[PDB]
Amino acid sequence: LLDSIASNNSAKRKDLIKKSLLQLITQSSALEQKWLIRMIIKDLKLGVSQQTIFSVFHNDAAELHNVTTDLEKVCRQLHDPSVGLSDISITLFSAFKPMLAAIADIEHIEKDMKHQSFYIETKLDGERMQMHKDGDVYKYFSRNGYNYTDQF
DNA sequence: AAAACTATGCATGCTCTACTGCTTCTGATCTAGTCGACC
């Protein structure tokens, strides 16, 4: 039902969205409808961190989610708790969580660089993107893993 | 010369086809607000 509603919103159709929501309402209880509303809004407020959920799911799941950024692969590969992954590293056509930068104090900057020469670069204002190229197959991914390939 | 039959013009009713006014449906435009994702 959620897939139908999302695709149908993407297709510029509202009568079908109304039908799907009506079916969900008619075939749900008050608590189920409340939870469904929370998932639609994309907030649950469970009080438990996503990192905790991933850790309980498998020993090495946060790293795999960072490298891949797709709940399907993490859920599929990490099924048997005993069986782990030998080596996890960036792979083609799979979004990876970008590496960010933290505030720095000009006074102790040299100390933060272990008293060694460093690189100074200009700050760029705009979107953060990553490009995957294999032959003439191109994929573009945004900061959080959304696919912007259609635009570019 | 008188009576009977028939012709034609007009009255009456009915039915059918333009034209004007009122009400309601549809389309096009504008204005206001909502949702996505990022920073």
3-state helix/strand/coil string of chain A: CHHHHHHHHHCCCCHHHHHHHHHHHHCCCHHHHHHHHHHHHCCCCCCCCHHHHHHHHCCCCHHHHHHHCCHHHHHHHCCCCCCCCCCCCCCCCCCCCCCCCCCCCCCCHHHHCCCCCCCCCCCCCCCCCEEEEECCEEEEECCCCCECCCCC
Distance CA A65, CA A72 (A): 10
Distance CA A99, CA A88 (A): 17
Classify residue A57 as exposed, middle or buried by CB count within 10 Å of its CB (0-12, 13-18, 19+). Answer: middle
Three-point CA angle A128, A130, A131, nearest 5°: 145
Q: What contacts A132, CB < 8 A, 6 or more positions away?
A: A92, A93, A138, A139, A140, A141
Cβ < 7 Å from strand B, A residues 123-142? 126-128, 142
Distance CA A64, CA A71 (A): 10
Contact, A49 vs A74, CB < 8 A?
Answer: no
Choosing from A12, A111, A123, A133, which is the catalytic residue? A123
Distance CA A139, CA A47 (A): 35
Contact, A37 vs A24, CB < 8 A?
Answer: no
Closest nt to residue A9, judged CA to C1'? B35
Which residue type is seen at A35? W
End-to-end CA distance of chain A: 31
Residue A123 in marked binding region: yes
Which residue type is seen at A51? Q
Q: Is A81 left (phi over 0), alpha (psi -120 to 50) or beta?
A: alpha
Q: What is the rounded (10 degree) CA torsion for A59, A52, A66, A122?
A: -140
Distance CA A15, CA A23 (A): 12
- Tokens 């929370």, residue? A38
Q: Determine the length of chain A.
A: 152
User: Separation of CA A42 and C1' B13 in angstroms?
Assistant: 81
State the structure-solving technique: cryo-EM
Contact, A142 vs A127, CB < 8 A?
Answer: yes
Distance CA A7, CA A119 (A): 46
Q: Is A111 a catalytic residue?
A: no
